[PDB]
RNA sequence: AGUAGAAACAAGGGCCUUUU
């Protein structure tokens, strides 16, 4: 108003001015960041001082004055010089009585964190102080639940589509994505009298996982570690249980379970097990609190360093740790390096196998359960191996699989007899090297492990060392021990490194690390199990139990909503001309029409073909119902009696506006469709009555030649627009495009893909 | 970040909210016409000045 | 996303990249390129977009991601089957439809250059289409389909905001065909220099750069050198065990004379009943006054020591006539000006106005720096400490805040040590002191940011509470602070501080006070001594003093590292029974080790933290830094650990270097040397 | 006078720069 008037007089005297002009005229609009420094810089090195220096002014505060003018609050109530036309004590007469906001509510949503973080130390129940000295490990760990982890980049497009939507950048791939998310926070802080910049922070506390290293015992979960401070230290411990909170554990579960099932579906394609796998991943979702999520931003977000992970991490490209894997076992290389040196094995009399062992000294941090180690290695041999765990078992295996990751011992040398030629090798045409072999015997029965641990020479437990020795049992002290296992007291403090590292995979899940080292494997995994997931999504066919009828269903239910793209013969252009008579001619209608339970398709022809004109002439319509309905307005209408529900012939109904398991919505989330628990996107190409708002329709448009003839619009005026105009638009922060409202966007994968191995004939 | 240049990105900024405020808000034509006249003048005086 | 590949797969397909890698491998050109020829070639992947021709059969044919080998046999076989004239240059793309090559061009500028020059350079031979980043097409024929424009121009916009995001949308990483060679600008004197800076061996940047970059290791040569330079040194190594530590040398003269702002042990107090309503401090310094015992002073004209007597006699009726007045500002007379140096600041005189003449007229020489003087050990510091482990008659001296709820055992048990450790701390003498220098620098802090430029008149007063009862306002004495105009900080203000006393001035100790015997005070009657100092304080000692209650946290933190520590070597809360019972060696008594409870030696804790926040200064410092080597090498001779060291001489002298009249470093040391003497007798490595 | 350190203050500009 007014004001925009002043504002204009303002940029009028600026550019009235020589300097500023030039300032102004000259680059681009990120100068705006540099210029945010060269002014307003000054620090002090006590504030605390100079804060009781300035307090004790005479009128230590700053207040506008037309806020000041406008609460009408007494100058002095009392002979106090609260300004001079200020003080402290005027904040004291503002809280205790004065101007009071409608409603203060929104505070809860804007710290939601510390809400939380509130609500759930309400929830544990304390046990009891003991004293002892606890054993803590100095290890990288997460200090902060957390649902729905995004990067910086994603949180930056969150905030300004959430808050400043004018100023909104051009649409990215995860908003389009992720509008359930962008919608819910958009709600709550719209249309409010707030600071936004505050919010925005507070938004981006909320969504980083503050990760940190630290010293822990215990358990380890993110619920614990914001207030670690008050469960132990070094001498103490106040037991406390808190395992029911913020549950986030099972989420991680379920994702590798995921991982797992499908890296094992996609070891059958020998030729082609990785395009097999990629297109499994992606063609997959699952479904956290109440947003579904795809699987490939869930891989990518995640840092559970497990070789489902870290194989899937791989095919998708994304760089990972630096973290190795062998069995159920964790290794960090501290140092050292080597290359590789074959080296045959007898399997029984005279059978070679080779196998390749490193040549060079190798230090490397293990982790099992409960346990931990620092051994080494040099040319074919255990050197030493240091031991800080706390039980017997996960000692002596933690012991086991270190000695076969070095490939020490006479059996490599000279194979057990036991073991034989079918097993060796080629389980599914693969062969399996010896090392992995040695795995699955040690796993097969305790004695073979005895009989491995025997291998390595025994002595007898000299004097004073008793207590740094370890038996076959694991035993903290005997008469005789294993040569060369020192044990300690203590976890080994895991290291730390800050590094991400390129790797690739092999035709057969080799994820090599831009060196030989394998990284990880589909043999490092357990055997096979059977998993009922809940809100998950396997939407392929060969990841599939339902029969043709449901499938078919929802097959046609997809084409249906593949014609709610833009373009003259479409739903939405239909609807725009008020043309309802041409959507009962529609193909994908005819091809649903068998289905149709056809003893009374024709009554429930008559009512649908009545709800969509009311629909669509009135102009209030639910796209979702729209959708839902069209396949019965093929056939003629006839009479009869409605008793509610709109049948198929497979004995399962549609009802006309309450949700059921055959076809579910949300208002909440208005761009899912869940058939037989099947996620159905709908593309965003018109808004809806719930629906509507800005994001509906970003989809719809695209960019184009630029057209200078063409007019320039709001971004409100975008609803208006026709289908294939054209427009000019500004977009984010200095930047003026054009857009034209027909939707091109092709897959890039499949195409880079397929031209990629073209080029390879 | 873009290839605008400030006064530039000022300038249709400013207009569009003109526009939308005469469209719906409270705002009359003639504001209108005023406060772009002056953004006309204020943009050739910055392009002539240096 | 430390490199470049990272960065080009957060738009960029990685397939892509994995592609433009290896071309860039195989031409051998920086991989900072592994962006734009990414981008080219995905820009032809989508831009083919699966089209056929109308045989039902692939349209458009890639030739770019091919190796060059075969670029140039697939670009000739298909020149020669449909037969075309064979092109000078290579394409991109090879339309069958119409049969003619494509290729593909992408400038981050809005301009026709390198357009233009393509057309040049290819005539109208084929199709050429120049993408923009910022929606500017430029062809020479029909332009595209219209999907596969729109898939191009939202992939570069895109990637247009991904870049302008990160720094990188310049020619650095996106240049032209002529504008790729990048190079820092080799200017003439920056090479002169280099050239000057290579060592003596070499004389031009280019012969250390050939000798380095292909140096190879000869160990032999290396390690003779470092035997022969292990020759020439002859390293000392002294186990401690062989070569004892002869006892400190400690300076030698008078007696380190008192330096505190405030009297402690002497200082006497007059107390009145607290009213809240009169609470500042000026007000409390007037009820004290009017009640008439403070106008009976009159000190006498003959002061028992000292100097500058009248001055001091002088200043003392004329704040006594301010307070009569109620307006505590002082005027600025010749006593005053002498006591407060208002005018002793040298003048400054210019040089240019300067001449061997004025030189002679007077003396001028360069400053001789007067170092400090070496003063000896006291005998007096003994007596304060005792003094000062003692009970005040009073409680509650420093203030505290209001301890907070309780949920859990932990918390119960930190309050229950807590409310033990503040109950005993609060009914000793140090804590008075703690308190009314709290108090007093206070006051003092916000009158020298108030009234600056008038000499005020500020009390040394602090409040406190009978035993188990009423509050109680003491007054120790009476401080005024000359024209404190703190322009910079750690500034300098002079001050002045008149307290009294019961006690006759010692020589040695008392060598800065100025006394009066000044009449006579019931408690009997009983004289009384007027101690007149003078001295000075700045911003930082204020704020600390003022902060001085961080004493109790240390204290806290040891006891309670103490008792956590002996009771989880047993697995039980043993806290009590370690207060209680664990004997702490406090000092010696007729030749033995006496010993008290913790409980008693919190007391001795505190007050070596207070003295270690009053008297800090560099000395201490030095010290406090230098004589723990001495206590690691106490605690490996407690354990039969063999320590050595290179040259324990160096470092004694090292530490005498840093005692000079600083009354506790003196004391620290002698009581270091008697440690380190009782514990010859069961240990090693020290000789007498 | 005094402070403290390995040099600086002991006001500077032309009349200005009270609640533990």
């Known amino acids: 108003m007014s004001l925009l008037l002043t504002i204009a007089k303002e940029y009028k005297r600026l550019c009235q001015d020589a300097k500023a002009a030039q300032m102004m005229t000259v680059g681009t609009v990120s100068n705006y960041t540099t210029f945010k420094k060269w002014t307003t810089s000054r620090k002090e090195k006590n504030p605390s001082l100079r804060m009781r220096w300035a307090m004790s002014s005479k009128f230590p505060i700053i207040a506008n004055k037309r806020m000041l003018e406008e609460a009408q609050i007494p100058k002095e109530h009392n002979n106090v010089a609260l300004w001079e036309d200020a003080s402290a004590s005027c904040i004291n007469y503002w809280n205790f009585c004065g101007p009071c906001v409608n409603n203060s509510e929104v505070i809860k ?309 036991t073991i034989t030629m079918a097993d060796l090798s080629t389980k599914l045409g693969r062969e399996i090297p010896y090392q992995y072999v040695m795995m699955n015997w040690i796993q097969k029965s305790e004695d073979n492990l005895e009989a491995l641990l025997y291998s390595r020479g025994i002595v007898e437990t000299n004097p004073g060392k008793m207590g740094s020795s370890m038996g076959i049992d694991g035993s903290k002290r005997a008469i005789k021990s294993l040569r060369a296992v020192t044990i300690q007291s203590g976890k080994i403090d895991m290291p730390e490194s800050k590094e991400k590292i390129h790797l690739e995979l092999s035709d057969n899940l080799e994820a090599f690390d831009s060196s030989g080292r394998i990284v990880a494997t589909i043999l490092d995994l357990p055997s096979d199990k059977k998993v009922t997931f809940q809100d998950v999504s396997f939407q392929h066919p060969d990841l599939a139990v339902l029969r043709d009828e449901k499938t078919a269903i929802t097959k046609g239910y997809e084409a249906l909503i593949k014609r709610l793209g833009t373009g003259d013969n479409d739903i939405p252009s239909l609807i725009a001309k008020k043309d309802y008579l041409s959507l009962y001619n529609l193909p994908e209608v005819k091809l649903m029409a068998p289905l149709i339970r056809p003893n009374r398709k024709g009554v429930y022809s008559r009512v649908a073909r009545k709800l969509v004109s009311t629909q669509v002439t009135t102009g209030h319509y639910s796209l979702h119902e729209l959708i839902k309905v069209l396949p019965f307005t093929y056939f003629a209408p006839k009479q009869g009696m409605f008793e509610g529900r709109l049948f198929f012939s497979n004995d399962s109904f549609v009802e006309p506006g309450v949700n059921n398991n055959v076809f579910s919505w949300s208002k909440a989330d208005s761009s899912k469709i869940y058939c037989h628990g099947i996620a159905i996107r709908v593309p965003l190409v018109v808004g809806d009555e719930h629906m509507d708002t800005s994001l509906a329709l970003l989809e719809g448009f695209s960019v184009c030649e630029n057209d200078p003839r063409a007019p320039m619009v709001t971004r409100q005026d975008l609803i208006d627009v026709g289908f294939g105009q054209k427009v000019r638009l500004f977009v984010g922060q200095g930047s003026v495009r054009t857009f034209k409202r027909t939707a091109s966007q092709r897959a890039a994968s499949s195409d880079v893909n397929k031209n990629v191995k073209k080029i390879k004939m | 970040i873009g290839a605008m240049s400030i006064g530039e990105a000022i300038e249709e900024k400013l207009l569009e909210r003109a526009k939308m405020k005469r469209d719906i808000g409270a705002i009359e034509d003639s504001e209108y016409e005023e406060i772009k006249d002056i953004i006309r003048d204020a943009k050739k005086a910055r392009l002539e000045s240096r | 996303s430390k490199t470049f590949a990272e960065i080009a797969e957060a738009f960029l397909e990685p397939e892509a990249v994995r592609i433009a890698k290896e071309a860039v491998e195989e031409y051998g050109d920086h991989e900072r390129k592994i962006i734009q020829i990414g981008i080219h070639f995905q820009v032809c992947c989508m831009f083919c977009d699966e089209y056929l021709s109308t045989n039902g059969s692939d349209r458009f044919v890639l030739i770019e991601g091919r190796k060059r080998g075969t670029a140039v046999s697939l670009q000739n076989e298909l020149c020669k089957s449909y037969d075309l004239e064979p092109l000078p240059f290579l394409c991109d793309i090879f339309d069958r439809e119409e049969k003619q090559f494509v290729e593909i061009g992408i400038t981050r500028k809005a301009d026709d250059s390198y357009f233009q020059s393509k057309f040049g350079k290819l005539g109208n031979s084929c199709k050429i ?400 001594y007027l101690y007149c100092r003078t001295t000075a304080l700045s911003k930082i000692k204020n704020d600390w003093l003022s902060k001085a209650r961080r004493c109790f946290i240390t204290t806290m933190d040891t006891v309670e590292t103490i008792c956590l520590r002996e009771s989880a070597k047993a697995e039980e809360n043993l806290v009590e029974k370690t207060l209680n019972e664990k004997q702490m060696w406090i000092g010696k008594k007729n030749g033995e080790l006496i010993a008290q409870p913790l409980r008693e030696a919190l007391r001795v804790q505190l007050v070596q933290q207070f003295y270690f926040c009053i008297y800090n200064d560099s000395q201490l410092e030095g010290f406090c830094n230098e004589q723990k080597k001495i206590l690691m090498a106490l605690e490996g001779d407690k354990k039969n650990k063999s320590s050595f060291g290179f040259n324990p001489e160096g470092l004694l002298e090292k530490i005498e270097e840093c005692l000079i009249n600083n009354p506790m470093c003196l004391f620290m040391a002698q009581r270091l040397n008697e440690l380190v003497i009782e514990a010859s007798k069961r240990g090693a490595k020290f000789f007498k």
């Open chain 1, 109 to 417: 949503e804007v710290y939601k964190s510390r809400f939380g973080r509130l609500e759930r130390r309400k929830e544990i129940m304390w046990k009891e102080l003991r004293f002892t000295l606890v054993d803590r490990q100095r290890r990288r760990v997460d200090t902060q639940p957390v649902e729905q982890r995004l990067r910086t980049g994603e949180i930056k497009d969150l905030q300004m589509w959430t808050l400043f939507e004018d100023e909104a950048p051009l649409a990215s791939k995860f908003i389009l994505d992720n509008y359930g998310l962008v919608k819910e926070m958009r709600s709550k802080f719209a249309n409010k009298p707030l600071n936004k910049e505050v919010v925005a922070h507070m938004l981006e506390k909320q969504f980083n996982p503050e990760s940190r290293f630290l010293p822990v015992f215990g358990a380890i979960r993110p619920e614990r570690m914001e207030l670690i401070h008050a469960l132990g230290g070094e001498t103490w411990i106040q037991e406390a249980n808190t395992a029911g909170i913020s549950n986030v554990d099972q989420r991680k579960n379920d994702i590798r379970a995921v991982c797992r099932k499908v890296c094992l579906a996609a070891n059958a394609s020998i030729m082609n097990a990785k395009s097999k796998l990629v297109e499994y991943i992606k063609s997959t979702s699952m479904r956290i609190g109440e947003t579904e999520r795809k699987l490939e931003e869930l891989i990518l977000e995640t840092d559970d360093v497990s070789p489902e992970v870290t194989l899937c991490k791989s095919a998708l490209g994304g760089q990972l740790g630096k973290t190795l894997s062998f069995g159920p076992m964790l290794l960090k290389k501290i140092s050292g390096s080597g290359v590789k040196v074959k080296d045959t094995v007898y399997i029984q009399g005279v059978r070679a196998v080779q196998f390749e062992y490193w040549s060079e000294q190798e230090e490397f941090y293990g982790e099992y359960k409960s346990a931990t180690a620092l051994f080494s290695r040099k040319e074919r041999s255990l050197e030493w191996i240091t031991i800080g765990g706390g039980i017997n078992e996960d000692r002596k295996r933690l012991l086991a699989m270190c000695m076969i990751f070095c490939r020490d011992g006479d059996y490599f040398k000279d194979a057990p007899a």
């Open chain 3, 129 to 528: 289409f120049v993408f923009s980043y910022d929606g500017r097409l430029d062809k020479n024929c029909e332009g595209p389909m219209e999907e596969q424009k729109l898939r191009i121009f939202s992939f570069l916009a895109t990637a247009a905001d991904f870049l302008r995001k990160e720094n990188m949308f310049n020619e650095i990483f996106l240049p032209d065909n002529e504008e790729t060679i990048i190079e820092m600008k080799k200017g003439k004197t920056f090479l002169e220099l280099r050239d000057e800076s290579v060592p003596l061996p070499f004389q031009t940047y280019e012969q250390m750069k050939d000798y380095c970059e292909k140096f190879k290791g000869n160990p032999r040569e290396l390690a003779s050198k470092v035997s022969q330079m292990q020759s020439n040194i002859k390293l000392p190594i002294k186990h401690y065990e062989q070569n004892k530590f002869r006892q400190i040398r400690l300076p030698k003269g008078p007696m380190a004379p008192y330096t505190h702002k405030f009297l402690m042990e002497e200082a006497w107090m007059f107390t009145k009943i607290s009213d809240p309503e009169r609470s500042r401090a000026g007000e409390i310094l007037i009820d004290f006054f009017k009640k008439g015992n403070l106008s009976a002073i009159r000190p006498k004209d003959k002061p028992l020591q000292g100097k500058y007597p009248i001055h001091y006699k002088n200043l003392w009726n004329q704040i006594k006539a301010a307070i009569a007045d109620r307006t505590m500002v002082i005027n600025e007379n010749d006593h005053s000006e002498f006591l407060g140096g208002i005018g002793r600041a040298s003048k400054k005189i210019p040089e240019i106005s300067l001449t061997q003449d004025v030189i002679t007229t007077e003396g001028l020489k360069q400053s001789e720096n007067k170092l400090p003087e070496p003063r000896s050990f006291p005998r007096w510091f003994n007596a304060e400490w005792m003094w000062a482990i003692k009970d005040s008659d009073l409680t509650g001296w420093v203030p505290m805040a209001e301890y907070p709820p309780a949920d859990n055992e932990l918390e119960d048990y930190a309050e229950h040590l807590n409310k033990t450790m503040e109950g005993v701390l609060q009914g000793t003498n140090c804590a008075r002191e703690m308190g009314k220098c709290i108090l007093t620098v206070g006051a003092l802090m916000t009158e020298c940011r108030l009234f600056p430029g008038k000499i005020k008149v500020v009390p040394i007063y602090a409040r406190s509470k009978e035993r188990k009862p009423s509050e109680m306002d003491c007054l120790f004495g009476i401080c005024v602070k000359s024209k404190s105009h703190l322009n910079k900080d750690d500034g300098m203000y002079t001050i002045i501080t008149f307290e009294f006393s019961i006690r006759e001035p010692n020589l040695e100790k008392h060598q800065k006070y100025t006394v009066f015997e000044a009449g006579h005070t019931t408690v009997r009657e009983v004289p009384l």
